[PDB]
Amino acid sequence: PSPESARRQLAELEETQERGEAEIARAVEEGERELERLEEEQKAGLPATEFHARAIAALTEWIARQEALLTRLQAELEAQFTRLLAELKAGLEPSRETLEQFLELREFWQEQGERQLALARELTDRQLEWVKRLKEWGLPQTEANALAIATLTRGAALLEALLTRTVAGVEAIFTEALAALRAGLEPSRETLEQFLELREFWQEQGERQLALARELTDRQLEWVKRLKEWGLPQTEANALAIATLTRGAALLEALLTRTVAGVEAIFTEALAALRAGLEPSEEFTELLEELRERFVEAYERLKEIARELTEWLLRWVEEFREWGLPETEAEALREAVETRGRALLEAIETRGEAAVEAIRTEREAARRA
């Protein structure tokens, strides 16, 4: 496994993504031409019933072909990435050099996933705009509403699947990384510095994931508001808003919980590596403290983020009552969001105190030997 061959495979992944985006772009243009030909067949005389069925059929098949192209493209990128990650693993040996490759693969794979998510966002937003064009062309509002719900809901499922698959792929990189940090026989303090760097990269990944999920929820909720103005009744739109907000609240909670877990996973491996090689000394004493310092602040940052996500969700709840949601329903949504935030804060507080106890308990055994 040469570090250049990985670069060759990394570039092949970027090309495969580019070939796929071009093919999808041509399918997008092909569908728009067929839908525009359907408008030109109308006005020029076409039975309205025939236009209704052909417009639904042309849009639906156009959306279906985009989903099949994006799904197959994701599977191919994931497969080539899986073989690449399996090439760094079982080939490269523990070193800071091996770590520099994993963090580079992490930045590449996260950039590729953000590209797939943005492409899927563009496709879904375009399909929904074409749903409105069909309404302007004569499609009844109830048809457009049902097809708008289906299109928006479909795009959400795909977008949620891409994020979940990207997060799972990034976690597999960090997992193989943290393993390389462990097999390194080097016991110098630079270990703690390597684990600390991994912690900041891991936490940066987490805040990046939460940002995408917030934008996902923001864009899904803003589409619900747009569909209401398009003719979707407030009654139905309020139910989709609660479901979307609940989905975003659950997704943000799950992502932050996974980030908090990884933070503890790096702490335990760092403390174990510190306890292994180093014996009760002055280096061990100082390194144990710095371990306590950065991780106490790391958990304090997660507590702050937890409060930010809670206030962001509560702002959407207050936006929902402005657009028609009954105040008791919003107050129930408020309690559900606050309950989520309280649970996240308690979990991080438990993790933080467990870290402090672990430092002290090992700080004691040093005064004991």
State the alpha helices, DSSP H only, in 42-95.
Answer: 48-88
What tokens appear for 333 in the block?
A: 């949504």
Which DSSP state fits 95?
A: S
In degrees, to the nearest 5, what angle opens at C-alpha 154 toward C-alphas 152 and 158?
A: 115
Q: Is 138 left (phi over 0), alpha (psi -120 to 50) or beta?
A: left
What is the C-alpha R_g of the chain? 25
Residue 131 near residue 146, CB atoms below 8 Å? no
Which DSSP state fits 100?
A: H
- Dist. CA 349–CA 25, nearest whole Å: 48
- Residue 351 CA from chain centroid, whole number: 23
* Nearest Cα to Cα of residue 173 among 116, 103, 100, 77: 103
Q: Which residues contact 72 (CB under 8 A, 6 or more apart)?
A: none
Tokens 């100082």 appear where?
286
- Dist. CA 212–CA 301, nearest whole Å: 18
Residue 127 near residue 173, CB atoms below 8 Å? no
- Reduced to 3 states, what is the DSSP secondary structure of residue 91? coil
* Nearest Cα to Cα of residue 334 among 236, 252, 251, 246: 246
Residue 360 near residue 273, CB atoms below 8 Å? no
Residue 247 near residue 337, CB atoms below 8 Å? no
Tokens 């192209």 appear where?
69
Determined by which method?
A: X-ray
* Nearest Cα to Cα of residue 23 among 59, 76, 60: 76
Taking each helix axis from N to C end, the angle separating 48-88 and 141-183, rounded to the nearest 10 degrees, works out to 0
The amino acid occupying position 127 is Q
Domains by residue range for the chain, with CATH: 1-141 (1.10.132), 186-369 (1.20.190)
Return phi, psi of residue 98, to 5°: -65, -35
- Dist. CA 322–CA 316, nearest whole Å: 10
Burial (CB count <10 Å: 0-12, 13-18, 19+), residue 183: exposed
How distant, in Å, are the alpha carbons of 171, 179, 291 from that of 295?
20, 20, 6
Helix (H), strand (E) at residue 175: helix 141-183
- Resolution in Å, one decimal place: 2.2
DSSP string, 129-140: HHHHHHHHHT--
Burial (CB count <10 Å: 0-12, 13-18, 19+), residue 15: exposed
DSSP string, 223-279: HHHHHHHHT--HHHHHHHHHHHHHHHHHHHHHHHHHHHHHHHHHHHHHHHHHHHH--
What tokens appear for 135 in the block?
A: 């309404």
In degrees, to the nearest 5, what angle opens at C-alpha 168 toward C-alphas 166 and 170?
A: 70
- Dist. CA 5–CA 354, nearest whole Å: 43
- Dist. CA 90–CA 74, nearest whole Å: 25
